[PDB]
Design a protein around this ligand. Structure first.
Ligand SMILES: [Zn+2]
Ligand SMILES: [Zn+2]
Ligand SMILES: [Zn+2]
Ligand SMILES: [Zn+2]
Ligand SMILES: [Zn+2]
Ligand SMILES: [Zn+2]
Ligand SMILES: [Zn+2]
Ligand SMILES: [Zn+2]
Lengths: 362, 362
């Protein structure tokens, strides 16, 4: 007895191409997506070169069109120099990404006035998402109100953050958010096992109380998204470990386990991995596309999943129930039981589909 | 030709009593105030013990009543434990102080939800002020909007912050702010002279561009307030220098110099050191109270001013024009030419005056 799900959407992945292809590339990352029951991904702009102008977007689009095995949209990244310059290409992107905390030299913003400039200049009908932790959530919400538009908050990880968003929603403010699986299924209690290198992630792992607050406030969470952030084991275990966990291959099995335990319903899962991603980002339907999962199969997450070049996982040793058996993408068998069966380049830029343009007034 | 000014008000001073009386006490700090042409001060709650509950407020009130030479009101401080407990004493305080950045263990708040709790529980008719730097300005403004009340931002120090506040005011939001003299008259250019210890202050000294932005946006600045934050030279020059500058004795001469240079008008100064402090904090008039200044007298700030126990100043070597000649407080000569002539205990708690209660609905 398999269950047929629609094509699931992950609105937050780092696929590392161009410039970090030892960590992941479009072909490997989208293989990972398909194996995790994900048929459409939105890829973040912190590549090398970063996707912060039209020529970099053009390059990344062609690399994705040639390498992706599932469908995709590409984010643009906000920089200290590009506000007011992205108008002609904005509609071709998934949305605009603001990195409001740490960052590399190029996505780093040093003043809230730069955030305001982006909110004022980016087309008002197009998505804006933010990496915004702790008080930064309140700060970017203020900027959104000053500029009278919406904002989507990436990977909410803390009781503090989910309660702030809950209060904003109660006041009718146009804010949505997503949560990543590591903030639902890992906590401080796991840091001893992971160690300080593997355990490095942004936002950091929360307390048990943070995790419990996210579950208790599931109603406030609009989307799940992995923040798939692959780095090699050498990098994670080295002297300056970069933050991030791979997660495409583990997200759906973790969440299916939670459904099996009655922690959320199948509908709760599908709102958060299908319907809400579609509506917040105006992502189009995928014809003849579905995912077949087996809810009975019990297994233990191994030391690495088959596809991501990260070749490690922080969920090693966790027992899960639920697995992806088959994925059909636009009428072709894309994945069956550990084997990806569509080639690099099968995937398409959904923003180029007629249905994939974000509607706007003339 | 002297000029008669009304009794000036400094809404942000640290007088260090109880618990730090080697740095300053009510008697020395209010002597400093009078010598700087200030007849009323609002004292911050980060003393030892900190003024975060009714018994500490009672103690501080009596110490101030016995030691102060000018009139005063005392702030309460927000803590992680006292939201919803200050209702019976709230009206007796200058207002509530939120320390939203660094802080000592007791005024430290670790979550924006704690800020919300204070905004929800503190009586809505009473003042709230915040130490809120950079993005924290936007974050606390968001909390103020969520709770539909006003907030006052302490010591605005950056172009980023003044422009954010300017944008909020343009949207009709109930926010006011103050600026301290060191952020108008010192910058990064002064750090070589000051050194890393003396130069330590929060908010830190800004760039030339920050300073210029504050002057250009004078219209946005509601008050001047010193953030008089005395520490001894030994402390400032030692291994873990605490942040802060003494400033009561230098604030008015610095600003008078600027008036003489046409950088702002006498009225601009008096709105910011008299009328706006009165109206934002509902501080009462002082009968028979005035300050006589000599606008012609040119002098150079020495290595220490006569009264503050800090016994140093970051403005050493600056040339100023303008000096306080005489202060009359409630019908008594309080200061003439380098000598304070009212004793410790002359000063009174203005919140106990009938005119000094903040009006509220029954
Ligand atoms: Zn992020
Ligand atoms: Zn995101
Ligand atoms: Zn990310
Ligand atoms: Zn459905
Ligand atoms: Zn402060
Ligand atoms: Zn203040
Ligand atoms: Zn202060
Ligand atoms: Zn007047």
């Amino acid at each position: 007895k398999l269950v047929r799900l629609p094509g699931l959407i992950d609105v937050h992945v780092h696929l590392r191409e161009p410039g970090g292809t030892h960590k992941e590339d479009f072909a490997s990352g989208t293989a990972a997506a398909l194996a995790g029951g994900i048929t459409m991904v939105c890829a973040m702009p912190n590549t090398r070169p970063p996707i912060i102008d039209a020529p970099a977007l053009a390059l990344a689009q062609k690399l994705a069109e040639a390498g992706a095995r599932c469908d995709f949209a590409l984010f643009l990244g906000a920089s200290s120099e590009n506000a007011g310059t992205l108008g002609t290409v904005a509609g071709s992107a998934a949305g605009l990404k603001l990195y409001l905390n740490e960052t590399f030299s190029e996505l780093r913003l040093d003043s809230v006035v730069q955030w305001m400039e982006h909110f004022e200049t980016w087309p008002s009908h197009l998505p804006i998402v933010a990496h915004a932790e702790q008080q930064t959530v309140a700060a970017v919400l203020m900027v959104a109100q000053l500029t009278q538009r919406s904002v989507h908050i990436c990977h909410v990880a803390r009781k503090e953050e989910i309660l702030l968003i809950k209060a904003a929603k109660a006041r009718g403010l146009p804010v949505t958010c997503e949560v990543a699986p590591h903030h639902l299924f890992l906590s401080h209690d796991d840091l001893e096992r992971l160690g300080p290198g593997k355990g490095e992630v942004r936002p950091e792992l929360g307390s048990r109380q943070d995790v419990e607050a996210l579950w208790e406030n599931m109603a406030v969470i609009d989307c799940f998204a992995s923040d798939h952030a692959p780095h090699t084991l050498e990098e994670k275990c080295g002297s300056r470990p970069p933050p991030g966990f791979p997660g495409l291959e583990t997200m759906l099995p973790l969440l299916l386990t939670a459904v099996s335990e009655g922690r959320l319903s199948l509908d709760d899962l599908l709102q958060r991995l299908h319907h809400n991603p579609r509506r917040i980002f105006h992502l189009p339907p995928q014809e003849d596309t579905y995912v077949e999962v087996d809810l009975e199969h019990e297994w233990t997450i191994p030391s690495h999943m088959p596809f991501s070049k990260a070749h490690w996982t922080p969920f090693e040793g966790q027992k899960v129930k639920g697995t992806v058996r088959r994925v059909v993408l636009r009428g072709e068998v894309a994945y069956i039981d550990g084997q990806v069966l569509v080639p690099p380049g099968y995937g398409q830029d959904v923003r180029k589909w007629p249905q994939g343009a974000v509607p706007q007034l003339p």
